[PDB]
Design a protein around this ligand. Structure first.
Ligand code: ARG
Ligand code: FE
Ligand code: FE
Lengths: 341, 338
């Protein structure tokens, strides 16, 4: 229970995982700050708290803030993982049977702490069509959705994708705060190693030669959503500097532009590459991850849910480096829900 | 309203910020030393809490014109004379003000500079230069600095421009204007939202305003943007809170587009009259929201005797990652090195 941090490689990605282990004093400091926020503010995503969240985040332990800041500017990061936060399992109570029942009094402190960590990386956002536009969402298995294509699945693999791949307002980070995970169930993660892929295919993937359609998981805004399915814009899968390209792809919702067989080939080459390159991150209770959604796709393996209140439960959040850029898709300046207007 | 958000520092708050800036000056060589900039976001967290609270309110106010932090400590005697050229303005005595500007700026985003402006420095200098009185660059004096979005030509233009006044003995005003969409017409707004305009790089990006030795390759992109400007919009985003991107001296409508030419001269008249004054006294730091306002500087008579007006300046981005195609490597802050 000493503080430690370091770099865990995956293939050629030398800083793929940045791991921080909290000392017991650091875990207690973070818990005390989250509990004070829960006393003073309405909700982990109420306007009063989110106006202050980026400043309150500055009260987290300094050594942790320095390591999170290094992760924030690492444009080859896959996952920042902060291990060893305090979770009182007894006080938390059972895993709820549905996200609609999961915004519990006992779990508030973990929503506040997830937003505090997240607010070191950017500004938290949610989505009108996802869990009623909650910014702090819940990942837990739902009975009768075992074979579903959403994060409430268990028995079937959650297929890998860039989060909200279709959207110009897609998150920079996806945050996950594990409350319990008795069977050590993993998030799957992959990035592109351009040195494992034919330069010709990489060139095609930088072309605006693909359609990324919304999941059925997804008005001027919702007019844009109907258009995105029926008349999808021609988009690239890779963008930015050749030395540090961003990745945007959905294994289930990406196709080449009509009649572009070459693009179809490059896409299916990339799908097989990322499929073969998938690795896993397991979050024990009190472990928090931020996936760099610019760099990695993510999903989840089949697992065996009991639905007895002991199942895996994460709090989840989306983070943007640039809240202002999505103002056209938000209700007002301070509102954080994409597609609310 | 709160378009201008002012924080007047207490003596303790001024002293705390000065102590932190001097601690940075004791540790690091330059206010844009790579080691300092890696450390800057967390060091900024050590600024006074009441100040960080008001900077955060400004950061999330999408109608902000400027945040002004008044009353930082500036030792005029220790600072010495105003240098005669920005090339000579990286003085030992002024380091502490460069460090403090970066600390305030790092609450709002990440600092960036330009390969094609003041030799790619991140902390730049605004002071009158003999022979540039009637120029269109920040070193002008006799000729008003025409109102502009900073680096309006570039998709990597700053979200905030930071100005730290070291010296302003004649109270020369910074000029500011926002756009009222209601007050120009829903008609003109529709035109301005169209990609029907040419915005060229301003003269500060030319090799004539950089050291002679600076690589020709840096200027290729600037010369291309002067010769062959892309068709771009002046307004973007939400109709209720649209962003503004225009330079009064370097913006034209696309050839043939009479409707666009009319929209632009309507905008130029609306912004010209609305232009209002903010005077930055010694120790005053302003952050202009470069998405919401154009800014300039009133005409003034420079004395060229070492007493002249002197600001430190910085560009701040909300999203450093978005410009990686234009930067040499992940941590490099100089736009146009790639
Ligand atoms: N309309 C103008 N004068 N535009 C250029 C403004 C000054 C420019 N930002 C500089 O540093 O020199
Ligand atoms: Fe997902
Ligand atoms: Fe300017």
């Amino acid at each position: 229970h000493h503080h430690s941090s370091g770099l865990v490689p995956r293939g050629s990605h030398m800083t793929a995982i940045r791991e921080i282990r909290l000392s017991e004093p650091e875990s207690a400091q973070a818990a005390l700050l989250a509990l004070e926020c829960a006393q003073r503010y309405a909700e982990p995503d109420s306007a009063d708290f989110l106006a202050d969240a980026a400043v309150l985040a500055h009260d987290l332990p300094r050594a942790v803030r320095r390591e999170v800041e290094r992760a924030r500017l690492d444009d080859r990061l896959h996952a920042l993982v902060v291990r060893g936060n305090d979770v009182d399992q007894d006080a938390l109570g059972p895993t709820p049977p549905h996200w609609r029942q999961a915004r519990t009094a006992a779990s508030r402190r973990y929503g506040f702490l997830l937003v505090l960590y997240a607010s070191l990386l950017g500004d938290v956002v949610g989505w009108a069509t996802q869990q009623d536009g909650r910014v702090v969402t819940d990942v837990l298995p739902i009975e009768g959705q075992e074979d579903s294509l959403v994060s409430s699945s268990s028995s079937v693999e959650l297929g890998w994708h860039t989060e909200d791949a279709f959207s110009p307002y897609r998150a920079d980070y996806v945050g996950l705060f594990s409350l319990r995970n008795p069977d050590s169930v993993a998030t799957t993660v992959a990035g592109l190693d351009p040195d494992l892929v034919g330069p010709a295919v990489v060139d095609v993937l930088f072309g605006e030669r693909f359609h990324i359609r919304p999941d059925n998981s997804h008005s001027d805004y919702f007019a844009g959503i109907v258009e995105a399915v029926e008349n999808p814009r021609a988009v690239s899968i890779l963008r930015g500097h050749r030395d540090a390209p961003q990745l945007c792809v959905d294994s289930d919702f990406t196709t080449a532009v009509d009649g572009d067989a070459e693009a179809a080939g490059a896409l299916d080459t990339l799908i097989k590459h990322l499929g073969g390159a998938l690795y896993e991150v397991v979050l024990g209770p009190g472990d928090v991850a931020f996936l760099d959604n610019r760099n990695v796709v993510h999903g989840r393996r089949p697992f065996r849910a009991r639905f007895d209140g002991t199942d895996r439960w994460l709090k989840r959040i989306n983070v943007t480096a640039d809240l202002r850029k999505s103002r056209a898709a938000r209700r007002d300046a301070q509102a954080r829900v994409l597609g609310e207007a």
